[PDB]
């Protein structure tokens, strides 16, 4: 799960509530991480006003952004052609981190038990 | 460690106070420095009075 650093993109192409992809600005496309097959980063879509939704980036091609909806459970909404793609959702990432550290500790304990 | 003040001079405010000349000093107020001492200025005397208020010349 790759991560991004200080990348805010204007969502130039209007995105339907059931949308397979979105388009970032040409300048900000390279600002986001490179990604690859099987590697992804989550992004928070901030609409005008307080509306915020969280998505999953399967991959990027140049300035075109492949997207999937409703990862944390945020409801799908229609998107105007002026929006923000920035920030990293702490809930999913730190939850995965806490689960992974505990899983590693449990696996090490099981390995110790099997060795004994 | 004597400090002696003689031949007084006027004020130069474009200088840090410690870096003033040896005989230059701050706030040279109502002093006439001619002979090299602290000769006091005389008090103004009222000669005449003006007619119209707020005279600028």
């Amino acid at each position: 799960v790759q991560f991004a650093n200080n990348a805010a993109s204007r969502l130039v192409g209007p995105l339907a509530p059931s949308g397979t992809s979105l388009t970032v600005t040409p300048g900000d496309g390279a600002l986001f991480p490179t990604l690859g097959a099987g590697d992804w980063f989550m992004a928070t879509l901030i609409r005008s006003d307080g509306a915020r939704e969280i998505v999953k980036v399967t991959s990027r091609t140049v300035d075109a952004m492949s997207i999937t909806r409703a990862q944390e459970g945020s409801s799908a909404l229609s998107f105007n052609p002026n929006d923000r793609i920035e920030a990293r959702l702490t809930a999913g990432e730190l939850g995965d981190f806490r689960d992974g550290i505990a899983s590693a500790q449990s696996a090490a304990s099981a390995a110790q038990g099997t060795a004994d | 460690t004597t400090l002696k003040l003689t031949a007084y001079s006027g004020e130069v405010p474009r200088t840090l106070p410690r870096l003033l000349p040896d005989t230059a000093s701050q706030r040279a107020l109502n002093v006439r420095l001619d002979n090299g001492g602290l000769t006091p200025t005389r008090q103004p005397r009222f000669e005449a009075n003006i007619s119209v208020d707020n005279a600028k010349t």
């Binding site: 006003d49 307080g50 | 840090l16 410690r18």
Partner: protein, 214 residues
């Protein structure tokens, strides 16, 4: 030198005048992709001419002749130069490389000066505090807003001493003697002074008793 002027770049020097001083703004790219941007103001008045450096790049200058304050354009905005009513900016001053004839270490620092007491710097600081409070209030009401609420400013003295090209100490005590570190012996010493307030003078000695002498 010719080298320094050529590297500065005379082709794109933006010029300006303030109090009989030529304000030159330079923005040139050093090889290997390093960029230096700053303002080089020239004052020939005095015993010998010298350069006072500044770090405010300006796209264009305008010296309003009627009121002698420079107006320089940076970021599509008109900024005055050291105009009244603003808090003092951080000052950089790195001393000449002092090659002592005998390698020694210094054990006395006297940073003289006075805290802000002219009350116009105090008024400017109060205005800055009001601006900080206003921006804090307006960011505090965001529907919320993480971080922000920027810290207010402060008046400080920060003198850094370079032993032989290495920073050994940063001293902030003022009007009282301070101490460097020990265990290092160097002969090419230099002093850098960083502060938001003015400093009268700095004197160094290996011992406080020697500091008594001068």
């Amino acid at each position: 030198t010719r080298n320094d002027w050529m590297k500065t770049g005379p082709g794109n020097i933006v010029g300006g005048q303030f109090n009989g001083r030529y304000f030159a703004s330079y923005e040139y790219i050093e090889p290997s992709g390093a960029a230096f941007s700053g303002t080089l103001i020239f004052d020939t008045t005095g015993a010998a001419p010298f350069i006072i450096r500044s770090n405010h790049k300006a796209d264009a200058f305008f010296h309003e002749l009627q009121t002698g304050a420079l107006y320089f354009l940076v970021g599509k905005e008109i900024f005055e130069w050291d105009a009244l009513g603003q808090v003092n900016e951080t000052l950089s001053w790195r001393s000449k490389q002092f090659v002592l004839p005998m390698p020694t270490n210094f054990g006395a620092i006297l940073i003289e000066g006075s805290t802000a007491a002219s009350e116009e710097e105090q008024a400017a600081y109060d205005a800055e505090r009001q601006r900080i409070e206003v921006e804090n209030a307006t960011n505090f009401a965001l529907p919320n807003g993480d971080m922000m609420q920027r810290l207010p400013a402060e008046g400080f003295v920060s003198v850094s001493i370079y032993a032989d090209g290495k920073l050994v100490k940063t001293v902030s005590k003022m009007n009282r003697m301070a101490r460097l570190p020990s265990g290092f012996l160097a002969r090419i010493w230099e002093i850098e002074v960083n502060s938001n307030i003015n400093i009268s003078d700095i004197v160094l000695a290996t011992t406080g008793q020697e500091l008594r002498n001068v």
